[PDB]
Design a binder for this molecule. Sequence first.
Ligand SMILES: Cc1nc(COc2cccc(Cl)c2)sc1-c1ccn[nH]1
Length: 213
Amino acid sequence: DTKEQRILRYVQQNAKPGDPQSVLEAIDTYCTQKEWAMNVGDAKGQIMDAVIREYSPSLVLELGAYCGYSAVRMARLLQPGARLLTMEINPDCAAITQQMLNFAGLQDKVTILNGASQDLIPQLKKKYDVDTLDMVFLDHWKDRYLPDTLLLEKCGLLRKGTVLLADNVIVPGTPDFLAYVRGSSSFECTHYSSYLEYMKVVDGLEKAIYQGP
Ligand SMILES: Cc1nc(COc2cccc(Cl)c2)sc1-c1ccn[nH]1
C-alpha cells in the first residue's frame, strides 16, 4: 500500500467526519509520529492560511495534491461559491485526495484534475471554463515551477494581482524560478521563511504577485 492510503486510514480512524480542522490535525499527528511527508507542515500551514485569508481568492489552482492535505487546508478557508482546481499526476493520489475531501466535507468546493500540469494548463479555458486565476499554489515537481509559471502567463491565465505561492523554494530548492520572479518587473515578490522540523533545516515559500505584461 501507498503512504497516501496509510494516512487516509489513520484519518478515517482518528479524525471527526465533516471537520477539516480534525482532518488536518490527524494528518499532522501521523506525519510527526509515524511517517514523514514533505507536503505536510503546520508552520508552512500558517503561511498558506495567512495568504488565503489576505487575498480571499474565488478561483485557486493547486499544482500537486498528494494525499489532499493542502487541498483540505486551502478549501476550508474559501468563501461560499469559491473553487479550488487541483492537478495531480498520480491516479492513486487523485483517488485518495477525493476521499480525503469527501471525509472533510469539502467536496463541493474542489475539482480534482488528473494529469500533468503542462497537459492540463493549456486546457483550463476551453475545457474547465477558466478566464483568469486569482491564486496559484505551486507544490509539484520543483524543476517545473519556472516552465509552468511561464506557461500560465503565455496561456493568459494570470491577471494583474494573481497571487503565486511556491512551496519548498529553499530545500529541495528552486533557484531558476526565484531568479526569474524576483528579477522581473512582471512580479512583486515576498519571501516567507519556514522551518522543516524533522530535518532541522530552514526552508521557505515565495509569494509572487503578477503585475501584468
Ligand atoms: C500535477 C503535476 N504535473 C507535473 C508535471 O507533469 C509532467 C509529466 C511528464 C513529464 C514532465 Cl516534465 C512533467 S508533476 C505533478 C505532480 C506532482 C505531484 N502531484 N502532481
